[PDB]
Amino acid sequence: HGYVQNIVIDGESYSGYIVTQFPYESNPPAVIGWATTATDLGYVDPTEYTNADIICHKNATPGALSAPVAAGGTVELQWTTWPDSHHGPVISYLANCNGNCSTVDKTKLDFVKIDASGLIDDTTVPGTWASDQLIAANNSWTVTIPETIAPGNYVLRHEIIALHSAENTDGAQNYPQCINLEITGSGTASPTGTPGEELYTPTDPGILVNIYQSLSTYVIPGPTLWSGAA
Numbered sequence: 001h002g003y004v005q006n007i008v009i010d011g012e013s014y015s016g017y018i019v020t021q022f023p024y025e026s027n028p029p030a031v032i033g034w035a036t037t038a039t040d041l042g043y044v045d046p047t048e049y050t051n052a053d054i055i056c057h058k059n060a061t062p063g064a065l066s067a068p069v070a071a072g073g074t075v076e077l078q079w080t081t082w083p084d085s086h087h088g089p090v091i092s093y094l095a096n097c098n099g100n101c102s103t104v105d106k107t108k109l110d111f112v113k114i115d116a117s118g119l120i121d122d123t124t125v126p127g128t129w130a131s132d133q134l135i136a137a138n139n140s141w142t143v144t145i146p147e148t149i150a151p152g153n154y155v156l157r158h159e160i161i162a163l164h165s166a167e168n169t170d171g172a173q174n175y176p177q178c179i180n181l182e183i184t185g186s187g188t189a190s191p192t193g194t195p196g197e198e199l200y201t202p203t204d205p206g207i208l209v210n211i212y213q214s215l216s217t218y219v220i221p222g223p224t225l226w227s228g229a230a
């Protein structure tokens, strides 16, 4: 359980959607993070992989703000304290809004995988994962905006999938978090994305998986990493 509470881009800081506070305010601030009803700080499970909740988490609505970032620059996402038990991959996607992201129809976002890390080392079961690297780096993850991606208004969908109960059908726990970015630069690529409701299935090898054994490989779920990615 947890959420993205802060975002840093080239020395400027942007509050996340503080789901522990904003849902209970009459006038919460405008932020680049999407609002969600995931008030218990929980997850989306595989029974919702074809439903709108998997896109940007439960009942999510776009943030009213966007953060500028140069193509080729970095975006740092700062999570709340992530529990070590929640081992799994850390996956990040960009989707062009082709318009103002704050009024986008989230079912029309086609997500391009631009960053993904999975099982790092399994010499001691259940292994060291991207989520453990995230914990060690001050509970944060940094992604690079591909330098060739065309400028525009994009959603960054940043996600931890916790696998500690994924040995059972519908056991995986997806924690997606969306923020709005205004990407600048001289990129010209418009890679093909995947609709959020088509990213994952409940039987994917990285989704239905028993991490309490030595794994020789872990297939990170979702579409292929885009060749333009860092």
Ligand SMILES: *[C@@H]1O[C@H](CO)[C@@H](O)[C@H](O)[C@H]1NC(C)=O
Binding pocket: 037, 059
């Ligand atoms: C989430 O959206 C559904 C579908 O419109 C709605 O029925 C439900 O009440 C919402 N849940 C909230 C706002 O907590």
Ligand SMILES: *[C@@H]1O[C@H](CO)[C@@H](O)[C@H](O)[C@H]1NC(C)=O
Binding pocket: 064, 100, 101, 102, 103
């Ligand atoms: C994008 O839409 C939001 C929500 O209506 C609005 O507040 C904001 O001003 C818009 N951004 C621009 C650059 O027009």
Ligand SMILES: *[C@@H]1O[C@H](CO)[C@@H](O)[C@H](O)[C@H]1NC(C)=O
Binding pocket: 006, 078, 079, 080, 138, 139, 140
């Ligand atoms: C570590 O994370 C906290 C909150 O998650 C943040 O306030 C702090 O600036 C971060 N430190 C660095 C060096 O990024």
Ligand SMILES: OC[C@H]1O[C@H](O)[C@@H](O)[C@@H](O)[C@@H]1O
Binding pocket: 148, 189, 190, 191, 192, 227, 228
């Ligand atoms: O449009 C998708 C396409 O965009 C990139 O710029 C190319 O390098 C290809 O490797 C990739 O498949």
Ligand SMILES: *[C@H]1O[C@H](CO)[C@@H](O)[C@H](O)[C@@H]1O
Binding pocket: 215, 216, 217
């Ligand atoms: C490691 O070993 C497993 C069998 O457990 C294979 O499925 C995998 O391809 C790799 O060789």
Ligand SMILES: *[C@H]1O[C@H](CO)[C@@H](O)[C@H](O)[C@@H]1O
Binding pocket: 122, 123, 214, 215, 216, 217
């Ligand atoms: C667990 O054992 C497997 C072989 O099945 C190795 O691939 C892995 O590195 C770990 O030693």
Ligand SMILES: *[C@H]1O[C@H](CO)[C@@H](O)[C@H](O)[C@@H]1O
Binding pocket: 216, 217, 218, 219, 220
């Ligand atoms: C082991 O093999 C799988 C493919 O079966 C890869 O996806 C993984 O990254 C590792 O190389």
Ligand SMILES: *[C@H]1O[C@H](CO)[C@@H](O)[C@H](O)[C@@H]1O
Binding pocket: 191, 192, 223, 224, 225, 226, 227
């Ligand atoms: C990942 O890579 C494959 C080809 O390697 C593409 O077909 C796909 O669209 C994604 O960019």
Ligand SMILES: [Cu+2]
Binding pocket: 001, 002, 042, 086
């Ligand atoms: Cu949890």
